[PDB]
Design a protein around this nucleic acid. Structure first.
Lengths: 267, 272, 277
DNA sequence: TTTTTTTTTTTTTT
């Protein structure tokens, strides 16, 4: 049974090679004494001194190449466009460096937004927010991809299953294993990462007494995990999105889930 | 006249019968200058007044027709005044650079139509009507994400096709788009990617200044949308307006069965 | 499988007695002919049917023959069916015009007006099994007690009558219309409940009416309408909240008098529902 | 085939 045909990403792919250029083609301000060359090549090959599987880039600098118009499509449509930024970077560093899962972080964002400022438009978009920690919870692994199979009786199919449930594998296997069936969960081949849930509280100085500040969770996915300390206010990356527990999918209930691919302790 | 259901309020009349409503002080016992100040600011959100169509004619009855069926007339009104804001554009011709401010949406905020007393007096006989209400804001519920256009995929092909959520419901095709493929493959709904808008909820006491004496005041159930979300902080008796809404709830738990008594809240059109 | 046994109780003729009970009478024109109208005239909602005149009417139905079967005792011995039968015949002799109905005016009055006008007109195209009688009412039915000084006719024992304590309340009192006295406590706030409750359909429309029976029910969608059904694939359908009717409901517990009670024995409060006017 | 639960007693504590 042939697979035809894959699609597409279109603009997302245009932004793939365009952001590929930007991540490769500087991304630099000052010639000579700068702040030149690339600085990201210096940074990624210095990141190959380490291979911690993470990067730092400025959004402000991301403006300059397209005057920020690409920064837009990566601004609101970001969640949609992530898978390309990474493998595009990977395509680029495949020209440079080699057991690899790369993690993006964007900082120096245009403006700090409030929790009261939190709205549905921000979904799949980068945003800067800061405030006080509540209850850091112990770190427990992120599935990313897993190996689970068979699936009746050994399909050994290992990849993907990265959906947010996170169950399950066993989807459309082997051939011919015909699962259904058990996944069956294969844990050992699965690469894991992070993560801890830290609920941020809205800061007192800004909040308008009487208020009782209404606050939600910041999840720490990325090596930026754990860097926080209770009581501090910290710049965050937006990624509004949503979480499962009003609508239902007829063959539910949802709420705000704040994530950051990047965090700094400032504040 | 475009007769509609039992609401039976004529389209392409109210729009027109509101269209001559333009330019009246009058009387009173603004008007178009509010419509006028609106456009430079581009804030949208018509504030209105109400009473308007009361008592001035035309539409002395339409003032009632909105009270009777607000869900409809608000749709018509916003729709009309979008075009009336377009109609003011033809005098100055090219405006605001240009037709995009005509693309920018508008909405009416009717308030102070009659005064109905408390949640206490509220009745089943009227399940749709606008109500003057009071009481202090208790708490602001967390921001509720809301479903507008649901996004879908499959492993077939994999493809990106998405459809409107419409009423609170979700119906995707079991299969399939693109191409074609078809194929038995189940639809892949991305939870996150789909379109969303802001809704909230607030619980509110009924006129804590007033009591049926001695019994405790009943609780106002309010929700709102857009700007009205995070409107004011709380502890505000002040005033509230909106049409009534009620919905049955599932019970035990899960099970997909009704509780056979409708949970009752307010569509909360406006507050001043 | 479900054994079945004859009993002297028969609803058949009692229905007829109810027809002759209402609109035909004198002592209190009669109260049942134009007040019923005043309900259909929309100046009143509650239909107050006194056990008093059930007694006085049996004074017209016995003494004063010809003799008639028992009523107030048959009433307070059952208490529930007499609102589904005694009231169901009221549809028959209710005045038509009635006076000055208008339409809108009242919200949803035009809805039901055009409900059955679009129903008969969409039924007129198909003809060129009906909305249940409980759907169009706009009147509640309230029985009132006979203490009574004229209960001394007498039927003697059959009068309760007495505002007995909940301790006095018994298991054989299920399905029995009675007087109880006691203090109001906690008095749940008034809330709408439900009655039929027409949910619209999506492709060719029509409608179906799910009866509101008991305290809960299963919701339903599929498609019932033959046209949206089987072609194609099935007409979707959702609830129309303005097609719904809600009877008024406020439930309140009533505690014992505390001097009705034996000396020990903590007060026993009982559960009550409110319906209507 | 699953259902559904906060006072009262005692305690250690500024």
């Amino acid at each position: 049974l042939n697979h035809v045909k894959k699609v597409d990403d279109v603009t997302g792919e245009k932004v793939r090679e365009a952001f590929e250029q930007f991540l490769e083609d500087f991304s630099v301000q000052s010639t000579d004494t700068g702040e030149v060359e690339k600085v990201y090549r210096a940074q990624i090959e210095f990141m190959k001194i380490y291979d911690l599987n993470t990067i730092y880039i400025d959004y402000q600098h991301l403006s300059m190449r397209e005057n920020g118009a690409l920064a837009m499509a990566i601004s609101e449509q970001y969640y949609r466009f992530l898978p390309f930024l990474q493998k595009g970077l990977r395509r680029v560093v495949r020209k440079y460096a080699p057991e690899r899962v790369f993690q993006i972080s964007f900082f120096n964002l245009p403006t700090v937004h409030r929790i009261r400022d939190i709205r549905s438009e921000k979904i799949g978009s980068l945003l800067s927010i800061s405030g006080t920690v509540t209850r850091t919870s112990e770190v427990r692994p992120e599935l990313y991809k897993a190996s689970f199979t068979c699936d009746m009786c050994r399909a050994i199919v290992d990849n993907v299953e990265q959906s947010f449930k996170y169950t399950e594998p066993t989807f459309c296997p082997n051939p011919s294993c015909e699962n259904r069936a058990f996944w069956t969960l294969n844990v050992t081949r699965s690469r894991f990462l992070d993560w801890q849930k830290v609920r941020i509280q809205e800061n007192a100085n800004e909040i308008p007494t009487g208020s009782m500040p209404r606050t939600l969770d910041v999840i720490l996915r990325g090596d930026s995990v754990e860097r926080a300390k209770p009581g501090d206010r910290c710049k965050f990356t937006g990624v509004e999105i949503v979480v499962p527990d009003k609508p239902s999918s007829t063959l539910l209930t949802y709420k705000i889930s704040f994530l950051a691919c990047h965090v700094i302790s400032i504040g | 006249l475009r007769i509609i259901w039992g609401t039976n309020v004529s389209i392409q009349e109210c729009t027109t019968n509101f269209r001559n409503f333009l330019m009246s002080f009058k009387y009173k016992f603004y008007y178009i200058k509010q419509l006028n100040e609106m456009r430079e600011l581009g804030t949208s959100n018509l504030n209105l007044d109400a009473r308007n169509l009361l008592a001035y004619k035309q539409t002395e009855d339409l003032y009632h027709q909105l009270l009777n069926y607000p869900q409809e007339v608000i749709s018509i009104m916003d729709q009309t005044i979008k075009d009336c804001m377009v109609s003011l554009i033809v005098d100055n011709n090219l405006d605001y650079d240009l037709d995009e401010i005509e693309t920018k949406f508008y909405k009416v905020r009717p308030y102070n139509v009659g005064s109905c007393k408390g949640m206490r007096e509220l009745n089943p006989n009227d399940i749709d009507k606008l109500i003057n209400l009071k009481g202090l804001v208790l708490r602001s519920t967390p921001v509720i994400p809301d479903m507008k256009v649901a996004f879908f995929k499959c492993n077939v092909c994999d493809h990106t096709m998405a459809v409107e959520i419409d009423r609170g419901v979700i119906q995707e095709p079991a299969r399939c788009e693109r191409i074609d493929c078809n194929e038995p493959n189940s639809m892949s709904l991305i939870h996150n990617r789909c379109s969303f808008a802001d809704k909230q909820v607030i619980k509110l006491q009924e006129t804590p200044d007033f009591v049926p004496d001695g019994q405790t005041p009943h609780s106002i159930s309010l929700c709102v949308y857009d700007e009205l979300v995070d409107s004011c902080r709380a502890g505000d008796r002040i005033e509230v307006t909106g049409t009534f809404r009620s919905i049955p709830i599932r019970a035990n738990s899960r099970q997909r069965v009704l509780k056979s008594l409708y949970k009752t809240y307010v569509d909360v059109v406006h507050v001043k | 499988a479900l054994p079945s046994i004859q009993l002297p109780v028969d609803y058949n003729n009692l229905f007829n007695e109810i027809t002759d009970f209402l609109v035909t009478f004198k002592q209190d024109g009669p109260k049942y002919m134009a007040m019923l109208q005043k309900v259909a005239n929309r100046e009143l909602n509650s239909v107050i049917i006194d056990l008093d005149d059930i007694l006085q009417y049996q004074n017209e139905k016995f003494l004063q023959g010809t003799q008639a079967d028992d009523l107030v005792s048959a009433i307070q011995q059952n208490a529930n069916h007499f609102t589904e039968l005694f009231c169901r015949a009221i549809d028959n002799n209710m005045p038509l015009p009635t006076k000055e109905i208008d339409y809108k005016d009242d919200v949803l009055d035009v809805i039901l007006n055009q409900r059955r006008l679009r129903n008969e007109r969409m039924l007129s195209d198909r003809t060129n099994e009906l909305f249940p009688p409980n759907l169009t009412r706009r009147y509640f039915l309230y029985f009132k007690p006979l203490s009574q000084n004229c209960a001394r006719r007498y039927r003697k024992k059959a009068i309760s009558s007495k505002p007995l304590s909940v301790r006095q309340i018994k298991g054989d009192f299920l399905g029995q219309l009675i007087t109880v006295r006691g203090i109001i406590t906690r008095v749940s706030d008034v809330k709408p409940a439900v009655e039929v409750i027409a949910y619209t359909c999506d492709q060719c429309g029509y409608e179906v009416f799910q009866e509101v029976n008991s305290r809960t029910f299963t919701p339903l969608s599929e498609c019932t309408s033959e046209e949206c059904s089987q072609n194609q694939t099935k007409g979707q359908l959702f609830m129309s909240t303005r097609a719904s009717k809600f009877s008024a409901f406020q439930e309140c517990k009533i505690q014992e008098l505390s001097q009705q009670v034996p000396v020990g024995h903590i007060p026993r409060s009982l559960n009550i529902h409110v319906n209507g006017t």
